[PDB]
Symmetry: C3
Subunit: 432 residues, 3 copies
């Protein structure tokens, strides 16, 4: 059940009812391809040239508040595992564990247990079916089918400098991926979540070309660990709130995704980086701040004493809309034409200057100036929370503008400083 | 005829002579693939496994001033149509309309008329040519050709979580796209514009994986509607204007594309998002503000009383160049070596400190510091508009710096406030 | 030998020991494909339809401190060469030079010498092997192999509007690319660098669809020229430094890559755009400022008199980490849990409020709040440079905040201005 509340007082809206699936860690697996080290004859010859060129190719290869975020190194974990694979005997240990089976767990020298997977055995095909020789066109066609995956994996690594994301189905098919997922050291809830959202897993994964040695091509596939699942998440949408006379504006800068997480709240300022499937919200904690849960008080009382709500101030009263989960915030200023239109695309509401809102219940589109917006048609209940625009409480003569990284308290203190000087001068001039 | 004017007074240039093609709306079409629900034998078997895996795969899938812009939901319209397709009988209505023909218009339950297109009939091939059985290698090769498009469409949807852009030729071939365009509910000028710029259409379109049901795979292709065409557009290029003594700077922040539109001007602050083909400018109104046409006065008189021109101020006098449509603005400060070189790449001009400009008439490259820039070699006429740099009119002792979201009037008022305090203190101290 | 120093006084770290490979220019080559202008029969027929559709398809196609950077036109050089190819006889001059050989140097009319390369001769295959006619399935399979490259090149150009980057192996194979590199007008050190980093070359190159005329399809491949190689580079990492009481913060804004270059320093503020292979740093001077070499003094003495070090100020004391080349800077404020954990992922250090640092020697991960970071496991020597946090030297009562584009001197002058007013008022009030 998605619900939404629009706060007329602060030109913002919160969409609730979502459930988290946060990427909190990384699981590293090792994917191997076993290789053979070596008219119809002419066709099979150039197909073998493609095989040989691909192998040497990989060998040559082997040789508003976003600014507050930290800086990670997203493939540090997989690169660390890849460095381990270059150590003496480490590849032979994997090649021995996969002689009899195609999937096995190996303990690496650095104290990390990895799943290994042999997804293609070109050694078996070339040595036992091709090295004897053609007579049959079926054999050249068959070789083209077995070789094609290696050729495409090589093409992908070649234009991506050895590191791909999302992980393609050439890197890992869906059968292989679902198989990997079922044996990961993770909870049953995690396996079910990953299996039902395999395309999101692919988008959050990396494939890291690693080593080609002892007739084994190995790459690391770095898959997300979802260590936070099924906690409540909510999306905060914000738009500029201006006077409508010489006008002053403020905007809540804390727009983004929020998810309850381990007694705090994970805040993702770039909402567009999260992926939303139905009511499940996939975000990456690398893109988050960890905030006190009192940050949510900014939605019910922006002047609350427990948390200093973030805002920016300006005098740039331009018109726009923010399309929410269940409706549309409209910031309409100056001479702009701002309307909402219904299922027959007849205008049913004309917005006055100010910040206002409509739900997707009877509205299909909103137009602000020359920009038409389609609203999301997701089912849910929207509530309009009436309130006097807080911009009305500010004296424009002492209003601090061009504040980007500001807050309620910061702005109040500047106002207090400005008023103190005026009161001091009026009394110092009257005494003189 | 492209022309350009450089304004020495404000370190900016306007390139004119372009014609608009603005994406203002969305047209939703439904693309269907009819499916069969079920040595040479071994080759045909695994090709059928690919077909079957692809089908279940899709079923698993089905289960400076940019900060002033609003926030849209770009696939709201297509997703809305896709939700309609999941309603009872809605797929059977499309499957019946396409039994006899491959393209037909269907009226959807939500009151929207859509073009539907059957681009591949795998049902017909598998049921009537493959289900009887091999003898012929031509039949296994033929099946590989018919199956390949489904396999590639599936691969594309798999790494893009069911939503692709640009729309590939696997999603829609050029014949199919040109066919679709010719029957859209659009003017003949729109059809001609789309047909002659099919690669831009592809880049502005979305493919949305929708439903697989009743032996029909359906995706929505969301194509741009160009509701503004052939109006004048112009590109504004801006660069920092600093004193050249302790130095102060300002930069016009309103750089971007401007197009006349419906009595106002659509302003696109991120010029790099628009696509330019010859003199035709493809921008998306989702990425625009709607401004009074008096915004253009900032190019002829930045102090004009009708529109408050936007600027940022600073003390960071670093050197750079802005390559324009027909030349190069050069902001050369401090000790930087700044030059322009001719067709033989001999230096023909050395820039002095300040903001200056050369046209592409005799210049192939400009170098600022260690950065070499190639200038665009588009034919056109450039005009150098002489004028005293406006930064010379500001007293640095009362110049407000670190103003990002500022304007001519805002800066003037801060200057006035600063001067008022100085005049008051000088008179209050003299009386004491 | 990579080394790193952490400056406790300024919450920053410098990673040293890297060597430059800067893209400073562009080399333009012309790549041509010679074309034929014209059950097994049914298979060969539709393969010829693909060939014909691809040809007409291309003919239709032919018809913190980043804000301080300038604006280039990255394909101006290649587009300039392409315009030359449309001039009368210019294509015939290339077609004659490639009749006997597949690679030749041609002097263009604009005074530029280009390497030309015939990578595929479909004219020879269609006219001499296909036009006589099928009997043999080998001939239809052979045609599918020769045609496939043209079909894929066309697909790539179609979804990229005629301009691709990185340059794929369909555009230029690795043999072709390595061949091109060996004959470029460049030093032997450049050839070796390009040949050993072909995947980086591909990522910095453009393919520009140019002309299809006189049975010749031609595209320009624009390859990087690395005119600065083997000079020292260093990476500056910075994180917010706040008091830990009402708190004030500053952050060094000059984070990014720095490379010695021609007596100055090339500064790349968006470090993520550079590519790092082992200790070689590939950056693009289009993404750089050219700075005095005294900018490096900010790392040893941020108050130095020779260069005015850049900082931003604020009151937003939120916690985060910056993962460096050899360790991790941790900015831990408020109630945040901040820890570092060892090879067995046991916590071995808990950070106090403030800015601190660990090396990758005994640490595998750092956690700040709900965000776990893996550190890079690159071998190297880290040095912790102790020093009193410079934020401790500022009186918070006169500290200017919300300064984004600021510097040490700018902040000092604002402080001086604020203190002057307070001292003047205290003396003017005491006299009254
Ligand atoms: C052209 S741009 O798109 O490159 N852009 C960078 C740009 C313009 C911007 O937005 N500001 C507004 C701003 N003032 C700030 C004050 C603090 Cl204390 C903190 C953050 C702040 N910001 C947001 C910047 C954050 C980042 F750029 F990193 F995203 C800003 C101010 C002065 C100079 C240039 C700019």
């Amino acid at each position: 059940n998605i619900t939404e509340e629009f706060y007329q007082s602060t030109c913002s809206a919160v969409s609730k009812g979502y459930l988290s699936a946060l990427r909190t860690g990384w699981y590293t697996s090792v994917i191997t391809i076993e290789l053979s080290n070596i008219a119809k004859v002419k066709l099979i010859k150039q197909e073998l040239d493609k095989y040989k060129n691909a192998v040497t190719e990989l060998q040559l290869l082997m040789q508003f508040l976003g600014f507050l975020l930290g800086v990670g190194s997203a493939i540090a974990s997989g690169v660390a595992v890849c460095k381990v694979l270059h150590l003496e005997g480490e590849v032979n240990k994997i090649k021995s564990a996969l002689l009899s089976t195609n999937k096995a767990v190996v303990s690496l020298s650095n104290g990390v247990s990895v799943l290994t997977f042999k997804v293609l055995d070109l050694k078996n095909y070339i040595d036992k079916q091709l090295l004897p020789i053609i007579s049959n066109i079926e054999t050249v066609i068959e070789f083209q089918q077995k070789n094609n995956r290696l050729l495409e994996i090589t093409r992908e690594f070649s234009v991506n400098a050895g590191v791909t994301t999302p992980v393609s189905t050439y890197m890992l098919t869906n059968s292989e991926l679902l198989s990997l997922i079922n044996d990961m050291p993770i909870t049953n809830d995690q396996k079910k979540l990953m299996s039902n959202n395999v395309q999101i897993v692919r988008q959050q994964s990396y494939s890291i070309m690693c080593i080609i040695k002892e007739e084994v091509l190995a790459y690391v596939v770095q898959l997300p660990l979802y260590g936070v699942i099924d906690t409540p998440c909510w999306k905060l949408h914000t738009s500029p709130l201006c006077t409508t006379n010489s006008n002053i504006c403020l905007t809540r800068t804390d727009r983004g995704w929020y998810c309850d997480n381990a007694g705090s709240v994970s805040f993702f300022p770039q909402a567009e980086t999260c992926k939303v499937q139905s009511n499940r919200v996939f975000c990456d904690t690398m893109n988050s701040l960890t905030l006190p849960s009192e940050v949510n008080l900014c939605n019910v009382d922006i002047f609350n004493p427990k948390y200093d709500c973030k805002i920016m101030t300006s005098k740039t009263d331009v018109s726009s809309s923010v399309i929410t989960s269940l409706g549309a915030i409209v910031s309409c200023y100056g001479k702009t034409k701002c309307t909402a239109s219904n299922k027959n695309r007849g205008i049913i509401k004309t917005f006055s200057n100010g910040c206002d809102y409509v739900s997707n219940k009877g509205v299909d589109t909103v137009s602000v100036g020359n920009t038409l917006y389609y609203v999301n048609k997701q089912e849910g209940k929207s509530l309009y929370v009436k309130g006097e625009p807080i911009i009305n409480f500010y004296d424009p003569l002492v209003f601090p503008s061009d504040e980007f990284d500001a807050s309620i308290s910061q702005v109040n203190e500047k106002i207090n400083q400005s008023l103190a000087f005026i009161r001091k001068s009026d009394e110092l001039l009257s005494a003189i």
